[PDB]
Design an enzyme around this catalytic site. Structure first.
Site, PDB file in Angstrom:
ATOM      1  CB  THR B  91     -20.455 -10.082 -16.002  1.00 29.83           C
ATOM      2  OG1 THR B  91     -20.343 -11.507 -16.073  1.00 29.83           O
ATOM      3  CG2 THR B  91     -19.171  -9.481 -15.371  1.00 29.83           C
ATOM      4  CG  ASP B 383     -25.413 -15.903 -22.221  1.00 26.50           C
ATOM      5  OD1 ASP B 383     -25.889 -16.221 -21.122  1.00 26.50           O
ATOM      6  OD2 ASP B 383     -24.185 -15.937 -22.446  1.00 26.50           O
TER       7      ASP B 383
HETATM    8  N1  LIG Z   1     -17.306  -6.889 -30.778  1.00 27.74           N
HETATM    9  C1  LIG Z   1     -17.359  -6.234 -29.515  1.00 27.74           C
HETATM   10  N2  LIG Z   1     -16.564  -5.186 -29.231  1.00 27.74           N
HETATM   11  C2  LIG Z   1     -16.624  -4.586 -28.033  1.00 27.74           C
HETATM   12  N3  LIG Z   1     -17.473  -5.019 -27.088  1.00 27.74           N
HETATM   13  C3  LIG Z   1     -18.299  -6.056 -27.319  1.00 27.74           C
HETATM   14  C4  LIG Z   1     -18.249  -6.697 -28.558  1.00 27.74           C
HETATM   15  N4  LIG Z   1     -19.142  -7.696 -28.522  1.00 27.74           N
HETATM   16  C5  LIG Z   1     -19.735  -7.699 -27.320  1.00 27.74           C
HETATM   17  N5  LIG Z   1     -19.225  -6.701 -26.585  1.00 27.74           N
HETATM   18  C6  LIG Z   1     -19.679  -6.388 -25.143  1.00 27.74           C
HETATM   19  O1  LIG Z   1     -19.241  -7.263 -24.144  1.00 27.74           O
HETATM   20  C7  LIG Z   1     -20.217  -7.219 -23.060  1.00 27.74           C
HETATM   21  C8  LIG Z   1     -20.715  -8.557 -22.758  1.00 27.74           C
HETATM   22  O2  LIG Z   1     -19.763  -9.487 -22.351  1.00 27.74           O
HETATM   23  P1  LIG Z   1     -20.075 -10.534 -21.257  1.00 27.74           P
HETATM   24  O3  LIG Z   1     -18.792 -11.169 -20.831  1.00 27.74           O
HETATM   25  O4  LIG Z   1     -20.974 -11.610 -21.796  1.00 27.74           O
HETATM   26  O5  LIG Z   1     -20.824  -9.734 -20.078  1.00 27.74           O
HETATM   27  P2  LIG Z   1     -22.242 -10.121 -19.505  1.00 27.74           P
HETATM   28  O6  LIG Z   1     -23.334 -10.344 -20.602  1.00 27.74           O
HETATM   29  O7  LIG Z   1     -22.606  -8.890 -18.698  1.00 27.74           O
HETATM   30  N6  LIG Z   1     -22.193 -11.401 -18.483  1.00 27.74           N
HETATM   31  P3  LIG Z   1     -22.916 -12.864 -18.845  1.00 27.74           P
HETATM   32  O8  LIG Z   1     -24.298 -13.010 -18.174  1.00 27.74           O
HETATM   33  O9  LIG Z   1     -21.919 -13.911 -18.198  1.00 27.74           O
HETATM   34  O10 LIG Z   1     -23.012 -13.098 -20.315  1.00 27.74           O
HETATM   35  C9  LIG Z   1     -21.296  -6.306 -23.503  1.00 27.74           C
HETATM   36  O11 LIG Z   1     -21.044  -5.097 -22.920  1.00 27.74           O
HETATM   37  C10 LIG Z   1     -21.148  -6.215 -24.955  1.00 27.74           C
HETATM   38  O12 LIG Z   1     -21.557  -5.033 -25.494  1.00 27.74           O
HETATM   39 MG   LIG Z   2     -23.053 -12.037 -22.130  1.00 31.15          MG
HETATM   40 MG   LIG Z   3     -26.206 -16.937 -19.104  1.00 25.67          MG
END
Ligand SMILES: Nc1ncnc2c1ncn2[C@@H]1O[C@H](COP(=O)(O)OP(=O)(O)NP(=O)(O)O)[C@@H](O)[C@H]1O
Ligand SMILES: [Mg+2]
Ligand SMILES: [Mg+2]
Ligand SMILES: Nc1ncnc2c1ncn2[C@@H]1O[C@H](COP(=O)(O)OP(=O)(O)NP(=O)(O)O)[C@@H](O)[C@H]1O
Ligand SMILES: Nc1ncnc2c1ncn2[C@@H]1O[C@H](COP(=O)(O)OP(=O)(O)NP(=O)(O)O)[C@@H](O)[C@H]1O
Ligand SMILES: [Mg+2]
Ligand SMILES: [Mg+2]
Ligand SMILES: [Mg+2]
Ligand SMILES: [Mg+2]
Lengths: 516, 516, 516, 47
Positions: B91, B383
Site C-alpha cells: 500500500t 507479510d
Molecule cells: N504501532 C504503530 N503506530 C504507528 N504506525 C504503525 C504502527 N505499527 C505499524 N505502523 C505502520 O503502518 C504501516 C503499515 O500498514 P499497512 O496497512 O500494512 O501498509 P502496507 O504494509 O504498506 N500495505 P500491505 O502490503 O497491505 O501490508 C507502516 O507504515 C507501519 O510503520
Molecule cells: Mg503491511
Molecule cells: Mg501481503
C-alpha cells in the site's frame, strides 16, 4: 450496361492521389515528431486486448498503432528498415521522409512536375551520401571511449535520465565481447533477459547465459565453480533402433536379464559422461529418471530438455561442442565457466552460467522496479547495441544534435546553385527538408527553432564548424563532437537514403485504386 | 478521402494525456489509502462469480478489482513488485506513487516542463536511497528479539488484534529454520496450510510437512516415531523394458512360472526397501496391490501417487533423496522425522511428518474459525515472513509509523536547497510527497494530520530523533524504535524506487492512443 | 463520471484545427480554380431533385454545391460579398483566399505564430489597397468606348465565344440608361427577361418594360403608339365604406335605383380616367368586368391585377405616378412610351412597353436556343452589368490578365524589405499569394506557368509596364490596357480585402468544437 | 474519459458498507432464530 472497373472501389486521381499520399505521409511523421531527441515525449499505446506499451521508440510506436492507410504503410517501412540495418534513428528517418513530402507539395503546387522533383531528390540524395562520407570521422573498432560516447548518445535519445555511464560501459563491453573473426557484430549474440528488481541500476552484464531450468535432481550440487560443461543433443535415455524391433521372452529369467541390460546401458552412458571430466551437463532432450540418479550419485549437475537456442548460446559462451553421440563425447568437447549456479532471481529459479573467459555470446540482465519500466530500458539498451555495433563495423561516426543535417543542408544548397532550371527547386527543397531534424530537436526542447537555426547555420558558414549544433540542455550552439554527442555515420546514411527512395516512390503516384 | 490513423481510436494529447494518467494514478492510490496502517479499514471484493475476498492487503485489493485503465495498471505494477521483492509495504508504495503524481500536477500547472519534473524526481530518489542507507540501523540476522519486533510490526499493519506474540515468534522460528547456506531466505520453503478449527490461536509451526494422503493399506501403522523415510519417484510395479517386449508361452506349466516371477520381483523390491532400514515410504507413482500387502506385512507405512511438489518438500524437510531405481536405495538416501502420523484435521485425514531435525522446508499450519477469517490471517503471516526474511538477508531496519518518511522528507528539503533552477521545485515536491505516509497514518487514526505533522517534524528538527513518529494507539509522538515499531530498510527502499521509476515513466507521456 | 463538455462532439485542436481549416479552404478554392479566365472550363451541378446548373460562375458554383464544412462556408462568404459589391471576380476572390491559406501553412510549419501571420497579412492587405489606388487608371462615366471594353473583358471571362461587341454595347447602353441623379447604378433597375428564340444574337435592350399580362378585353387595341399611360394601385371596382354599412330597401322601385347607382359610378371612374388623357392603363388591383367594358368602349387599353413590382418598373420606365385615388388622376400623372403592344413571345402573350424616351428602368431581353444556354448568357450579362456599373460609379479601372496582381506582388515584395523580423515572412507570403491569379490563368490556358510568370515579372521590372500581362489568346506578354483587357478597380480591391479579412479570421482559430 | 475502476461495478462505502454487512448478517440470523430451542419451528425449503 456494366462498369469496367469494379463498382466496389474508391479512386483518387492526379492532385487527389498526390494530396492523399503526401498528407498520409506527413501525418505519420507528425505522430512521432514529438518524441524526437532527449527532450521528446513518450506515447502510451493500448491495443484492442487492453495491453499497454509505453515508449519513446519511433518504430515501436509506428508498429503498435494499427495503421491501415496505404501511403502511411509505405513510410512505416522506412522505420522498419532503419531498425533492421542500424538499430537507431527510426524516428529521424520517418520525420525526414514526411518533410520531403511536405517540401514536395509546395513544388507540385507551383506546377513543378513529379518526375522533376523525383529527379532532383535523387540527385540531392546521392550528393548527400557523397557529402556524408567527407563529413564522417574515422574511429577504431576498439576505442572504448568513443564507443561509450556512442552508447551514451543513443540512450540519451530516449531521455537524459536513462543515460548512466555504467550502463553505456556495460553495453560497450557486451558488444565488444561478441565481435566475430570478420569484425562483424551479430546483435542476437547479446541475450536480453528482463527481471524485476530493486532498481534499473541493478542491470548487469553476464559473461555467459541464463537458462530457465532447474537441475534435474535436488541431490546434485546447486553451485559449481570452474565447471566443466558437457552439451548433449541426444537424449540420455535407452537407445532404440530405427528398424522396428521386438523382444520375445519365453524364459521367466530373461525378464530380469533384459531389465538389467537397459539399466546397464544408462549406467554406461553416465560413465562415459563422467569420463570426459564434465561436472555440469545440459541435455537438449530427455534424461531418463534412472540416469538422473546416476548423474546425481556422481555429483554431476544436469538439466534436461534444454531449449535448442539455449544449447546454441551455451556453446557460444562456454566454448563447448554440442555432441550428438554420448559415445563420442570427450574432454575436448567440454566448455568452461567460472560459475554454474542454480538460484532464484525475482522469485524464479534459473541456472546461471557466468564468468566465462572469452564468451562469444553474453547476456544483458536488465533490472527495474516494474515490468513496463524494464521494457523501455530494454528498448534503449537495444538502440545502443545497434549503434555500438555499427561503429565497430564501420569505424565511422558523425556529430549529432542535428549538426550533420545542418552541414548537409548548407552544402546541398551550394550544390543546387550549379543545377540548371527546375530541378534546382527540388534539390533545394531536399536541402531544406534535412533541417526538420535540428528544427524539431529545438522545438521539443521548448526553444525557438527559427532563431536556433539561424545561429547553427551561422556557426557552419564561411568554412565554420561542421560539428556545431544546439545542445538541447545548455541552450547554446556548441561543438557536438567536443561534447561527445556522436552517432554512427550509418544512422544518417540509412535514414536519408530510405527517406529519399520511399518518397521518390510515393511522388511517382498519380492514381490510387483502393478495393473493398 | 481515407483516414490516416485508425478511426477506431481514442486519443488524448498534451494536457489531457497528463490529466488522464495523473488522475488514474491518484484514483488507484486513493482506493487502498484508507487501508493504511493499524487503524486502516478493510475492503470486501466480490467478483463476477460471487466469490468473496476480504482483506487489508494492498496488492491483493489492487489485483482483485478488475482495473483496465492503462495508467492505473502501470501503478498496480508497483504493488506487484513490492510484494515480490519485499512482501510488505504494497500500500505504501502505491500511495507514494499517487502522491508523486499529485505533486507533479501542481508543477505542470504552474508551467514546469515534464522532463524537468522527471529530472528532479530522479535526483531526489537517488539522494533518498543514499540517505536511507545512513538512516538504517544495523541488526544481526540471528537476533530473534528484533526479528520478532519486525514481525509484530508487520502484523500490526493489518490490525493490532492480529498481532499476537506467539504468532510472531512462530513466524520468526519458521523463517529462521529455512535460511540457506548463502544466508538467503526463499519464502516458498515455508509451506502454508489452512485448516478451520477452534481458534486463530491454534495456528502452529510444524517442523516438517503435511501430505494430503492416506497410507495405502489400513494394515500399516498409523504412527511411526523416529521414522526412517524412503522417497521413491519410480512406481513400485513390475518394470517394463523400454524396448517393446512380449512373453510367449507354449507350455501350460510356464503360465504360473511367469506369474510367480512377477510376484518374486515384487517381493524383492519390498525386501530392498526394508533392507535400507526404511519404515516409511512416499512413492510419487503407483504401488502394486501385492506390494502394498508386502509393505504392510513388513510394518512399512507407504503412500502412493504423491504429488511431485510433495516429494520435493518431503526431501527438503527430512533429508531424504528421491530415488529412481529401488535397486540403488541405500540407508543414506533415507530421511528422518521424529514423528510420522496419519491423522484427521478438520475432518480430512492427512499424513503429518513432524519433528524433523534440520528441516530445510517447514509448514505454518494456520487455523481459525472460518475460511475467510483464515485467509486474512494467512495474508498477515505472509507479510511477516517477507519482512523477517528481508531483515535476515539485509541486516538493516528503520523505524516505522512514518518517522523514516519524515526524516527523509526533512533531509531532502535541505538537499533541495542546493539545487539550481526549476529542478529545485521538483526535488521539493518529491520531499513533500513522502509525508503522505505519516499524514495518512494519522488520518486513518482519526487524528488531525496537519497538527500531527507539525509535531513530528519538530521532533526531527535540530538534529533530534530520526525515529520519532506518531503512535496511532498513544496519540503521542514517540521514539518508534524504542516502541518496537520497526520495519526492514528494504520496505522503504523498494517502495520509494518503484514510486520514483513508475511515475517518471508516466510523466514522460504526452500522448495516449487507445484502440477499440 | 460524468463529462464536462458534451459527449456528442468532435474537437480538433492546435495543428489539427489549423489543418482542417486550411485544407477546407484550399479545397474550396481548387473547386473553382479550373473555371478561372477565358480558357476556364465549366461545371454541371445536379441537385437532389435532379435539377441542373451549367455555369462558369464562381459564386453560383459554390452556392449550388451543398458545402457543409464550417471553414469552407467561411470562404464561400467571400464569393457572396464579391457578387454583392461588384458582381464580378467571385472566383478570383476565393482563389486568392485559398492561396493565402496555403502560403500561411508553410509559415505555420516553421513555427511562426498565427498572430504574426495575421499581422503580416493585414499589413500587406492595407499596403495593397494603397498601391491599387495609384496603379488604377482614371476614366469618365461617359466614356462608352472604355465601358464597352470593361463589358467585353467581363463577358470574355466566361469564354471568348460569349463576348460579342453588339452584346457589350447593349449592356453599356442599358447601364448608362439607369444611372441615377447622383451617378449611382442600381443593377435592379435593369430588368432581366429570359426567353427562348432563334439565337443568342437575338438578345436586345428594351427602353421600357415587359409585362406578363394580356389586356383585360379583346375589344381593346392590341397596339398603341405614343401612348399616354395611367398607373392605378386602387381597384376600379365599386367603392365601399370602411365603416360597416348596409343598404335597406323597402320600396321595390329602389332595387334598380341602387344597381343603377353602382354602375353609374363605375361609368364615372372610367370617364375620370379617359378625361386625364390616358389611353393605356395598368391597375394593381381588380377591374370590375363592367368597367372593363367601358374602358373597351372608350378605346383604352387596360391590364388588371398587375403585380406591385411591375407597377414600380412601369413608373420608373414611363415616368407615370402610381395613383391611389381615381378622382386624383390628372394628366400630369400619365407616363409616355413610343409603343405599347400586346404581342406573343415564344408562345407567351405579353405587354411590351417600349421606346420610352428617358427610362429610369430598362429591360434586357435575353434570347437563346435553350433554357440552359440562356441561363449562362444571363449570368454573363449580370457580370458585365456589375462591372460597367462599378466603372461608372468609381471612374477607376486596372489592366487585367493578372497584370495588376503581378505589379501588386512586385511592389509588396519591395515593401516587405522594410519590415523587421518575422512579420516580413508573412508580408512576402501575401505578395507571393497574389500570383496565384496569373499562374492559374496560364495553367488553364495550357501554358507553362513558371516561365510565363518569369516573363511577366521581367516586363514589370525596373520601370516596366504595370499593364504587362499574358494574353491567353496569343501566348505572348502584351500590354493588357492597349489590348483592351481591363476591369474595374473595385474587382481587385474587394477581392483582396475579402480574402485578407476572411483568412485572418480563419488563421486565428486554434480549436474547432463541432456538435452532433 | 475513461474511468479507472471498472464501469460494471457496484460500490458501498463507509456507513453504507457497514450497514449492508450488518443488515445481511442480521437477516441471516433472523432466518434461523425461530428454529432455536425445543419450542422452535421448522422450515420447508424447496429447490
Ligand atoms: N504501532 C504503530 N503506530 C504507528 N504506525 C504503525 C504502527 N505499527 C505499524 N505502523 C505502520 O503502518 C504501516 C503499515 O500498514 P499497512 O496497512 O500494512 O501498509 P502496507 O504494509 O504498506 N500495505 P500491505 O502490503 O497491505 O501490508 C507502516 O507504515 C507501519 O510503520
Ligand atoms: Mg503491511
Ligand atoms: Mg501481503
Ligand atoms: N545532448 C544532445 N543535444 C542535442 N541533441 C542530442 C543530444 N543527445 C542526442 N541528441 C539527438 O537526438 C536524436 C535522437 O533522438 P531519438 O528520440 O532517439 O530519435 P531516433 O533515434 O531517430 N528514434 P528511435 O529509433 O525511437 O530512437 C539524434 O538526432 C541525436 O543526435
Ligand atoms: N484576353 C485575356 N487575357 C488574359 N486574361 C484575361 C483575358 N480576358 C479576361 N481575362 C481575365 O480572366 C479573369 C476573369 O475570369 P473569370 O473566369 O470570369 O473569373 P472571375 O471574374 O473571378 N469569376 P466569376 O465571378 O465567375 O465571373 C480576369 O482576371 C481577367 O482579367
Ligand atoms: Mg534514438
Ligand atoms: Mg529501437
Ligand atoms: Mg468574371
Ligand atoms: Mg456573376
Amino acid at each position: 450496361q456494366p462498369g469496367v472497373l469494379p463498382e466496389n472501389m474508391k479512386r483518387y486521381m492526379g492532385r487527389d492521389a498526390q494530396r492523399m499520399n503526401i498528407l498520409a505521409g506527413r501525418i505519420i511523421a507528425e505522430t512521432v515528431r514529438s518524441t524526437l531527441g532527449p527532450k521528446g515525449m513518450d506515447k502510451m499505446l493500448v491495443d484492442d486486448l487492453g495491453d499497454v506499451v509505453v515508449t519513446n521508440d519511433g518504430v515501436t510506436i509506428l508498429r503498435e498503432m494499427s495503421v491501415e492507410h496505404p501511403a502511411a504503410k509505405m513510410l512505416i517501412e522506412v522505420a522498419k528498415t532503419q531498425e533492421k540495418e542500424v538499430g537507431d534513428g527510426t524516428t529521424t528517418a520517418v520525420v525526414v521522409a514526411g518533410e520531403l513530402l511536405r517540401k514536395a507539395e509546395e513544388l507540385l503546387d507551383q506546377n513543378v512536375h513529379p518526375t522533376i522533383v523525383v529527379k532532383g531528390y535523387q540527385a540531392a540524395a546521392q550528393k548527400a551520401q557523397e557529402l556524408l562520407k567527407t563529413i564522417a570521422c574515422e574511429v577504431g573498432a576498439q576505442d572504448k571511449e568513443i564507443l561509450t560516447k556512442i552508447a551514451m548518445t543513443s540512450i540519451t535519445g530516449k531521455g537524459a535520465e536513462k543515460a548512466k555511464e555504467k550502463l553505456a560501459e556495460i553495453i560497450v563491453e557486451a558488444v565488444s565481447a561478441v565481435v566475430d573473426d570478420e569484425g562483424k557484430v551479430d546483435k542476437d549474440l547479446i541475450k536480453i533477459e528482463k527481471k524485476s528488481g530493486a532498481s534499473i541500476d541493478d542491470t548487469e552484464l553476464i559473461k555467459g547465459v541464463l537458462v530457465d531450468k532447474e537441475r534435474v535432481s535436488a541431490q546434485m550440487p546447486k553451485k559449481v565453480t570452474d565447471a566443466k560443461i558437457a552439451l548433449l543433443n541426444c537424449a540420455i535415455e535407452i537407445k532404440e533402433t530405427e528398424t522396428d524391433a521386438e523382444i520375445r521372452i519365453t524364459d521367466p529369467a530373461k525378464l530380469m536379464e533384459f531389465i538389467e541390460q537397459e539399466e546397464k546401458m544408462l549406467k554406461d552412458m553416465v560413465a562415459e559422461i563422467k569420463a570426459s571430466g564434465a561436472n555440469v551437463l545440459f541435455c537438449q532432450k530427455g534424461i531418463d529418471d534412472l540416469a538422473q540418479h546416476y548423474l546425481a550419485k556422481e555429483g554431476i549437475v544436469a538439466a534436461r530438455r534444454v531449449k535448442k537456442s539455449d544449447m546454441e548460446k551455451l556453446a557460444k559462451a562456454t566454448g563447448a561442442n554440442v555432441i550428438a553421440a554420448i559415445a563420442a563425447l570427450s574432454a575436448q568437447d567440454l566448455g568452461d565457466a567460472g560459475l554454474v549456479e542454480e538460484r532464484k532471481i525475482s522469485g524464479d529459479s534459473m541456472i546461471f552460467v557466468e564468468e566465462c573467459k572469452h564468451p562469444k555470446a553474453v547476456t544483458m540482465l536488465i533490472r527495474g522496479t516494474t515490468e513496463h519500466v524494464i521494457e523501455e530500458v530494454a528498448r534503449a539498451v537495444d538502440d545502443a547495441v545497434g549503434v555500438v555495433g555499427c561503429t565497430i563495423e564501420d569505424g565511422r561516426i558523425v556529430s549529432g544534435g542535428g549538426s550533420t543535417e545542418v552541414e548537409l543542408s548548407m552544402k546541398l544548397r551550394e550544390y543546387a546553385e550549379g543545377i540548371s532550371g527546375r530541378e534546382q527547386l527540388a534539390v533545394r527543397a531536399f536541402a531544406d527538408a534535412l533541417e526538420v531534424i535540428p528544427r524539431t530537436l529545438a522545438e521539443n526542447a521548448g526553444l525557438d527553432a527559427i532563431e536556433i537555426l539561424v545561429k547553427v547555420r551561422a556557426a557552419h558558414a564561411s568554412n565554420g564548424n561542421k560539428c556545431a549544433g544546439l545542445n538541447v540542455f545548455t541552450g547554446a550552439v556548441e561543438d557536438m563532437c567536443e561534447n561527445g554527442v556522436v552517432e554512427p555515420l550509418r544512422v544518417k546514411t540509412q535514414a536519408i537514403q530510405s527517406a529519399a527512395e520511399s518518397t521518390e516512390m510515393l511522388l511517382r503516384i498519380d492514381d490510387v485504386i483502393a478495393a473493398e
